[PDB]
Amino acid sequence: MRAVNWNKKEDDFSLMFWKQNIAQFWTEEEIAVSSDKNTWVQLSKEEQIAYKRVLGGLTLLDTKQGGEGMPLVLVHLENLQAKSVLAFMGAMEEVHAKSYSHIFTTLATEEEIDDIFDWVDNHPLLEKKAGIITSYYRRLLKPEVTKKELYMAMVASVFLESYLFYSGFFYPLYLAGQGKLTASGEIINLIIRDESIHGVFVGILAQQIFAELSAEEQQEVQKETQELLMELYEIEMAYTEEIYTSIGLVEDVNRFVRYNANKGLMNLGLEPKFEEEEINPIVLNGLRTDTKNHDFFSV
Amino acid sequence: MRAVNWNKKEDDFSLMFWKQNIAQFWTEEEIAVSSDKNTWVQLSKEEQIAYKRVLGGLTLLDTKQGGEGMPLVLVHLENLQAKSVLAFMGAMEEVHAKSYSHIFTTLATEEEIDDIFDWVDNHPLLEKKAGIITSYYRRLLKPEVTKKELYMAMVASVFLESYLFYSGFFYPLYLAGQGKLTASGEIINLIIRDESIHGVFVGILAQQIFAELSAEEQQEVQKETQELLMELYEIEMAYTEEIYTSIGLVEDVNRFVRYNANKGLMNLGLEPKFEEEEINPIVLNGLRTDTKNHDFFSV
Amino acid sequence: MLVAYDSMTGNVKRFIHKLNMPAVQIDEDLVIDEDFILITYTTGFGNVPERVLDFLERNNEKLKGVSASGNRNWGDMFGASADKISTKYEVPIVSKFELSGTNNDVEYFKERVREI
Amino acid sequence: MLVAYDSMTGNVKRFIHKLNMPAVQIDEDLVIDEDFILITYTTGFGNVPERVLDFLERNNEKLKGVSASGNRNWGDMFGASADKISTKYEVPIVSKFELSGTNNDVEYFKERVREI
Ligand SMILES: Cc1cc2nc3c(=O)[nH]c(=O)nc-3n(C[C@H](O)[C@H](O)[C@H](O)COP(=O)(O)O)c2cc1C
Ligand SMILES: Cc1cc2nc3c(=O)[nH]c(=O)nc-3n(C[C@H](O)[C@H](O)[C@H](O)COP(=O)(O)O)c2cc1C
Ligand SMILES: [Mn+2]
Ligand SMILES: [Mn+2]
Ligand SMILES: [Mn+2]
Ligand SMILES: [Mn+2]
Numbered sequence A, B: 001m002r003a004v005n006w007n008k009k010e011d012d013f014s015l016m017f018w019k020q021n022i023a024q025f026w027t028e029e030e031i032a033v034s035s036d037k038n039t040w041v042q043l044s045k046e047e048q049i050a051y052k053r054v055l056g057g058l059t060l061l062d063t064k065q066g067g068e069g070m071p072l073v074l075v076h077l078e079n080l081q082a083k084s085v086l087a088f089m090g091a092m093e094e095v096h097a098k099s100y101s102h103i104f105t106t107l108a109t110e111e112e113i114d115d116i117f118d119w120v121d122n123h124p125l126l127e128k129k130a131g132i133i134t135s136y137y138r139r140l141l142k143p144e145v146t147k148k149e150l151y152m153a154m155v156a157s158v159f160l161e162s163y164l165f166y167s168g169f170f171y172p173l174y175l176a177g178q179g180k181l182t183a184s185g186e187i188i189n190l191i192i193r194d195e196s197i198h199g200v201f202v203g204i205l206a207q208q209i210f211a212e213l214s215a216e217e218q219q220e221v222q223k224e225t226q227e228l229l230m231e232l233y234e235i236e237m238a239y240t241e242e243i244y245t246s247i248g249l250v251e252d253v254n255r256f257v258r259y260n261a262n263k264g265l266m267n268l269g270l271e272p273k274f275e276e277e278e279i280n281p282i283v284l285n286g287l288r289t290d291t292k293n294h295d296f297f298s299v
Numbered sequence C, D: 001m002l003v004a005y006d007s008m009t010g011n012v013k014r015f016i017h018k019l020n021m022p023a024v025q026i027d028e029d030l031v032i033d034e035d036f037i038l039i040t041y042t043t044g045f046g047n048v049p050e051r052v053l054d055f056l057e058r059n060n061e062k063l064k065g066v067s068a069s070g071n072r073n074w075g076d077m078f079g080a081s082a083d084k085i086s087t088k089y090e091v092p093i094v095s096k097f098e099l100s101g102t103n104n105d106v107e108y109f110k111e112r113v114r115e116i
Helices: A014-023 A034-040 A045-075 A080-107 A110-122 A124-138 A147-164 A166-176 A182-212 A215-247 A250-267 A281-286 B014-023 B034-040 B045-075 B080-107 B110-122 B124-138 B147-164 B166-176 B182-212 B215-247 B250-267 B281-286 C011-019 C050-062 C072-077 C080-089 C103-115 D011-019 D050-062 D072-077 D080-089 D103-115
Strands: C002-005 C023-025 C036-041 C063-070 C093-098 D002-005 D023-025 D036-041 D063-070 D093-098
Touching (some): A014 A080, A045 A080, A045 A124, A045 A147, A045 B045, A080 A182, A080 B045, A147 A166, A147 A182, A147 A215, A147 A250, A166 A215, A166 A281, B014 B080, B034 B080, B034 B182, B045 B147, B045 B166, B045 B215, B110 B124, B147 B166, B147 B215, B147 B250, B166 B182, B182 B250, B182 C072, B215 B250, C011 C023, C036 C050, C063 C072, C093 C103, D002 D011, D011 D036, D011 D063, D011 D103, D036 D050, D063 D072, D063 D103, D072 D080, D080 D093, D093 D103
Parallel strands (some): C002 C023, C002 C036, C036 C063, C063 C093, D002 D036, D036 D063, D063 D093
16 A cells, blocks of 8 residues: 655645645634624614625535535545645635634624524525535445546635635625625635635645546536536525625625636636626735734745 | 634634634744754764654644544534634645655655655555545545544544644654754644644534434444544554664553643543653753744744 | 543543543533543644533532643653643642553552552 | 736636736746836735735835735725835836726726826
C-alpha cells in the first residue's frame, strides 16, 4: 500500500494549495462580534429575519460540505497529495459552520436560535437544494466508483463552493458594505477567502478527470453539467424570492447569483452562461476588509 | 436536513475536544530539523536503516487514518458536533504524514527516500497490518451501516491511534531520550500529543455506541475485540522482530507495545490484558520536550 | 480519611473502586468538613478541571494531599494538576498514576495516605 | 506591442486568446528585446508569481505596462500583483480583470494599450 511522499510531486498544484490552506488558517475566537449589537438593533424586523435565515442556510451547506462533500470525494482519489488538501479543506468547512454559531450567540437568544435551526431543518427549498448536491456525493458510498461519477461529484462540489453559497453571502456583505454588522462581515470574508480557493482546487481536479474520460462520456457529463447548473438556478430564484422579497433586494441578489455562477463555470474550465454585469458596488465594499490580510505564517 | 448548532450541546464532550484540537494546532515549518544532521551521522548504518524504516511505517499508518479512517467513520455519525471533531482530527493526520517528509528531506537524499517508500509499499507485513485495520473501514463504504459495524471500526481506529503507532514511535523517542535527533523527536512528540487525544475521543464514541447494542451484539463485539487485539499483537511481534533485531532492542519495544495496548483497551473502557511493567526510562526522557507546551490560543 | 474525586471519562472513577476506601464524587455544592485526599484527572497542558478548582475554593481547609491521574504521553505535563494544587495550597503530592492506575499505583497510594 | 504573460490554471491564457495580439508565455530563459505589456495572475495575499518576478529581473527595461488577472473575492488584494509591479518598475497599471475577463475587459485593455 502507498504512503504519501511529499518529496516527489504527484501533481503541479497540491503543494501550492496545501501551503495556502494553512497560511489562511483561522478560528472564530480571533474575531469578537459583540460590538455588532450596536448596529443590529438598528435593523428592521424583516432585515433581522433575512439575516438569520441566510446564516442558517449557510450553516446547512457548510455542514454537508464538511461532513459529506469533502470526505466522500477524497476517499476515492488516488492522488495522495490532493487527498491531503481536501482533508484540510473539509476541516475548515467545520470551522466555517461553527463560526456562524459564534455570530448567532451575539445576535439572538437561545430560543431564537433553536427556531432558526428548526426552520432550516424543515424548509422544503433548502431540503431540495441540499438534496440535489448531496445525491452526487452519496453515489460515492460504494467501494468502486467510475470516473464519470467522480467527475460529477466534483462538479456538484464546485457549484456549491463557487455558486450556491453566494445567495447567502450576499446579505452579510451588503450590510457590511454599509457599515452594518462589520464584525460578522469580517468572519464572512474569511469564509469567502477559503471557499474561493476551495472552488479553484476542486475545479482543477475535475478538469484532470475530464481529460481521462472517453469522448462519449465527455459529451454526457457536459450535458449533465449544463442541466445541473440550470436546475440549481431555478431553485436559487425561488430561494431568493422567498428570502429577499420583504426587503426589496431580489433583483440585486439574482444578479449576484449569476455573476458567481459564471465564476463557478470558469473554475471548471467552461465558458460563462450568463450575461456579464457589474458586481453590486456596496457588496464590493463589503469585501474590503483588513482582516483578510492575515497570514498565519508571518505571525 | 439538520445543520450543526453549537449553541445546543449534542453531547458532553465534543466542545472540549474541538477546542483542544485547535489549541494543539501546529505545522512542520515550526520545527527546523537541520541541526539533527550532527547526530545523524554518528549513528551506525543499522541504526539509520531502522530509523528510516519506522518513519516509513508511521507515514503509511497516518496516510490510511487521514484518508480512510477518519472520513469513513465520520460520514456515518449522526452527532454533528462529534462529526466536526473527527474532520479536524482527520486533517491533522495529514499534517502528521507530511511532517515525516520534512524529516526525511534533512536525513536522506531523494533516491534514498524513494527506496524507503518502495520498501513500505511492497512490505508484506505492513500490507497485512494496514490491511487488517482498513478492512474495518472499508465495510463502511455503503449507505447503511449497522451499529455493530460502526463500533468495530471505532475499535480498529482506537487500536491504531493508541497501540499500533507505538512500535514505530518507540525508536525516535529512544534516541531523543539520549540526546540524538532531538529536533525530529520534537515533531514526534507533537504527533503523539495529537494521537493521545485522538484515541481518547474515538474511545468515548465507541463506548456510547456499545451501550446501544443488544446484549447479544455486545457479547459478539467483545469477543471480536479480543481476537483483533491478539491478531494485531502477533503481527506487531513479527514486525518488531524484523525492524529491531539488528540493533538489539526487540524485547524493549515489545514491552512498550504491550504497555500501549493496555492504554488502548482502557480508552475503550476495557480492562488491561498485559502485565504491568514500567515504561523504559530512556523513552520516558524522550517524551520530555518543551515544545509540547505550545498552546495556539496563547500566542 | 475521605477520598474526594472527579472523573470525566471514568479512569479516576475506576481507580477509586480499587481503593476500597470511602469516596465521593465532587460537585459544585459539595461541602466536606472532614480531612480528605483529592484525586483529580489532568486537563490539557497539565491543568486542573475547573470543577475541581471551584470545589477547592470552598473546601481547601480540609485538604490533606492530592493525587492526579494523567498520561505520560504529556511529558513534563504528566499529572501536573497535582503540582498546581500542591503549590497553591501547600499540601503534599500523594502520587501520580496513568489512566486507571496499576496495582502498584494502588498500593503506593494506600501506603502514601497512611504516611500522611 | 508584444504581450508577455504567465498562467497557472488557464484563465490568463484564455484571456490572451481573446486579444488577437501577438503573445508569448514567459519561462525562466525568455529574453524579450521589444516593448511589451505584461499580464500576470495574482497569487495568495495579492502577490506576484515567482516566475514573473524572475522574468522581470532580466526584462524590466522593455516593460511598458502591466495587467493582472485576479478575483474580487480578495477585496483590496484583488489583482494587487499589478500594484507591486507598477510601483517597483514605475510603469502604469493597464487594467485589472477577474479570471478570464469580460468582453468589456478585453476592449478596455486594447483601448488602454493604444493609449500607451
Ligand atoms: C483533552 C485532554 C487533555 C489531556 N491533557 C493531559 C495533560 O496535559 N497531562 C496529563 O497527564 N494527562 C492529560 N490527559 C489525560 C487524562 O488526564 C487521563 O486520561 C485521565 O485518566 C482522565 O481521567 P478521567 O477518565 O477520570 O476523566 C488529557 C486528556 C484529554 C482528553
Ligand atoms: C492560491 C490562490 C491564491 C489567490 N490569491 C489571489 C489574490 O490574493 N488576489 C486576487 O485577486 N486573486 C487571487 N487568486 C485568483 C487568481 O489570481 C485568479 O484565479 C486568476 O485568474 C488565475 O489566473 P490563471 O488561471 O491564469 O492561473 C488566487 C488564486 C489561488 C489559486
Ligand atoms: Mn465553508
Ligand atoms: Mn469550501
Ligand atoms: Mn497521526
Ligand atoms: Mn490520530
